[PDB]
Amino acid sequence: ESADLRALAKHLYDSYIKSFPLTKAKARAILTGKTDKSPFVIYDMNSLMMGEDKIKKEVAIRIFQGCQFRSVEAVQEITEYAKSIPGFVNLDLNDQVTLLKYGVHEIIYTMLASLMNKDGVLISEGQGFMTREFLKSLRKPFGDFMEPKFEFAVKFNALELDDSDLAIFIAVIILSGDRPGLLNVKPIEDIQDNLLQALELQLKLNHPESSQLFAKLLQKMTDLRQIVTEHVQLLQVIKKTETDMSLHPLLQEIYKD
Amino acid sequence: ESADLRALAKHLYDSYIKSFPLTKAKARAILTGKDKSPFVIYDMNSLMMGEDKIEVAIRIFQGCQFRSVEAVQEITEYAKSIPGFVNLDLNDQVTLLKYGVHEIIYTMLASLMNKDGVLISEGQGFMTREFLKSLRKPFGDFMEPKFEFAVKFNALELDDSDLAIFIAVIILSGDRPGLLNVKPIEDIQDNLLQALELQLKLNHPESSQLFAKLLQKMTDLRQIVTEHVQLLQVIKKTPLLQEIYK
Numbered sequence A: 001e002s003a004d005l006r007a008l009a010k011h012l013y014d015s016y017i018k019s020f021p022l023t024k025a026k027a028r029a030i031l032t033g034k035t036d037k038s039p040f041v042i043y044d045m046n047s048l049m050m051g052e053d054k055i056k057k058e059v060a061i062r063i064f065q066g067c068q069f070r071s072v073e074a075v076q077e078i079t080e081y082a083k084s085i086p087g088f089v090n091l092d093l094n095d096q097v098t099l100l101k102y103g104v105h106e107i108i109y110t111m112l113a114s115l116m117n118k119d120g121v122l123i124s125e126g127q128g129f130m131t132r133e134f135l136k137s138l139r140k141p142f143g144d145f146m147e148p149k150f151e152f153a154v155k156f157n158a159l160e161l162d163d164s165d166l167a168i169f170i171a172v173i174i175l176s177g178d179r180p181g182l183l184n185v186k187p188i189e190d191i192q193d194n195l196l197q198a199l200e201l202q203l204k205l206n207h208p209e210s211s212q213l214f215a216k217l218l219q220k221m222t223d224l225r226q227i228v229t230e231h232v233q234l235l236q237v238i239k240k241t242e243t244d245m246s247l248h249p250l251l252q253e254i255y256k257d
Numbered sequence B: 001e002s003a004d005l006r007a008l009a010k011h012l013y014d015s016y017i018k019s020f021p022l023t024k025a026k027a028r029a030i031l032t033g034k035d036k037s038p039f040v041i042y043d044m045n046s047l048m049m050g051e052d053k054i055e056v057a058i059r060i061f062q063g064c065q066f067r068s069v070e071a072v073q074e075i076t077e078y079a080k081s082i083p084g085f086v087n088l089d090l091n092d093q094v095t096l097l098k099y100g101v102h103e104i105i106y107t108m109l110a111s112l113m114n115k116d117g118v119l120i121s122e123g124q125g126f127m128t129r130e131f132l133k134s135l136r137k138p139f140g141d142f143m144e145p146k147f148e149f150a151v152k153f154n155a156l157e158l159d160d161s162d163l164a165i166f167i168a169v170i171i172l173s174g175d176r177p178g179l180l181n182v183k184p185i186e187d188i189q190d191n192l193l194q195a196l197e198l199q200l201k202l203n204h205p206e207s208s209q210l211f212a213k214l215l216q217k218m219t220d221l222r223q224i225v226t227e228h229v230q231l232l233q234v235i236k237k238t239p240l241l242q243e244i245y246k
């Protein structure tokens, strides 16, 4: 039944709303200009300095730590979402762990697009906006931790997915049976099969004009895995140049690979 | 309607047949049993003898390079049969082939692999997976990751009629760098993705979401290609031939 597939879509969206406080629909309204929601914009060093008057070491390192602590919170949100995916909690525990390990960054980058346009990124739950140019002007190697994410986001945002669509898509990502070290691949793939079915139907119904959106969206997984691999190499660089800089343990355990 | 998609499938199947001499069907016959058994290369002495039927690590890598150059010409000709492709801006055609060939090379190589080895020399030979893996570095860990991709890819149990369309989808990727006019490329890939999906629903009706699983294997191809190019740089730190091969 299509109807079981719709009930799954409905369940996952419902769970997405409950897990991620800043949705795409909120993010767009803030970016588009829909009076009370307007972000303070950070574009230079004085602007950033002033930003702490109302928004919530060294500048580039302070930014990078902010991004770290934010990534940690998003892991917690994504972890809470994953538990809602039917069957995920019933899987072997080591695999639950493994699927989060490989899935969580791919999700962070997918959802972070929702917060981005061509000229910058929302911060502090939408209260701020930090320009692309400001981030790109940052002392090397930090200069371009963010540029690939912008490049992905402008391409990805042109698919025009809304939160409904994304709730099913990020569920597909977590439950990838091709993750390294997985003990029982088969139960994971049967869940994903079901999830892929749900996504396909949801896109057909919600984007009836958008030809082969399902395939176009699945092909984006490639862009996501490229973004992760480049990040990790960048992290290796920082750990050696910035020997005085500390990485959150949670994050270190994900990257251990 | 679907009869346009079917026409497009048959066209590409027929073109794939005329372009690639060793088909998957033919390679499986040889791998499984069924047309002399290929000459097997599992040792240093088997290699030495196998040359007479048909420095060591290096002569083997130069052979993949030679056969890769052959495969590029066969893929080029196949590309030209894909509806729309020759009508694209010439620079974009070159660009599509340049970036797409490595991906298609690995896809098609999986047809000639099992978990224990790979056919060579138009299937007259069979080099074992263990003899490749044993080769001194960095030539050992070279072919192993295509074997692992090939094991997973092959489980989908795709046939030649399915791969013909899948290959076409790869070639028409609108995200290649430097493309001048992305629209007609994506427009053709849309039409190909539609033919692929309907092919897989008729040809594999019990195979749930095979279409999606196949598309998810593109993430595996690009990761592979990106690793291959990364081992080549390290080999470049090990006359007219270099030119041919580049």
Ligand SMILES: *[C@H](/C=C/CCCCCCCCCC)CC(=O)/C=N/CC(=O)O
Pocket: A063, A064, A066, A067, A068, A070, A071, A121, A122, A123, A124, A125, A130, A145, A146, A235, A247, A251
């Ligand atoms: C880090 C960048 C994320 C973009 C957010 C804007 C910059 C940070 C300002 C403070 C944000 C307030 C919510 C990309 C990333 O994944 C970094 N990770 C650190 C790590 O070690 O993985």
